[PDB]
User: Fold this.
Amino acid sequence: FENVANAGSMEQFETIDHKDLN
Amino acid sequence: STFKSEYPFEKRKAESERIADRFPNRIPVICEKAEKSDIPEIDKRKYLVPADLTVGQFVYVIRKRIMLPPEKAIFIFVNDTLPPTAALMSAIYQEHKDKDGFLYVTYSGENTFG
Assistant:
């Protein structure tokens, strides 16, 4: 909350793939 | 505490813009457990969702993630609405996306519209 923001995703995204639906 | 509460606006929008650049065909979604429900908690809250998925397809993945048994209820809420599982996630995004560029959803074992 203090400094210039950065786009870094340190808390990573979970990627959903289409094969997760099989 | 919520994703929105943990990160300032400029950081959240910076992230969704980075996803826009790197993964233009993925919807950035925050998925969190609703307050007044004993439904199981979820280990991860940030998802990149293929833009073609339906709500029902997305829900299938979330149910697996929280290891919900097939007989138990779940409801995914967006913006104080309950979208049908036939709806396209792309359509939900376009209507309900946050100013920070994410789509925020909450899940519950209770249907508050009942």
Summary: The longest strand of chain B covers residues 26-33. The first helix of chain B runs from residue 3 to 6. The beta strands of chain B are 26-33, 46-50, 75-77, 103-108. Chain B is about 30% helix and 20% strand.
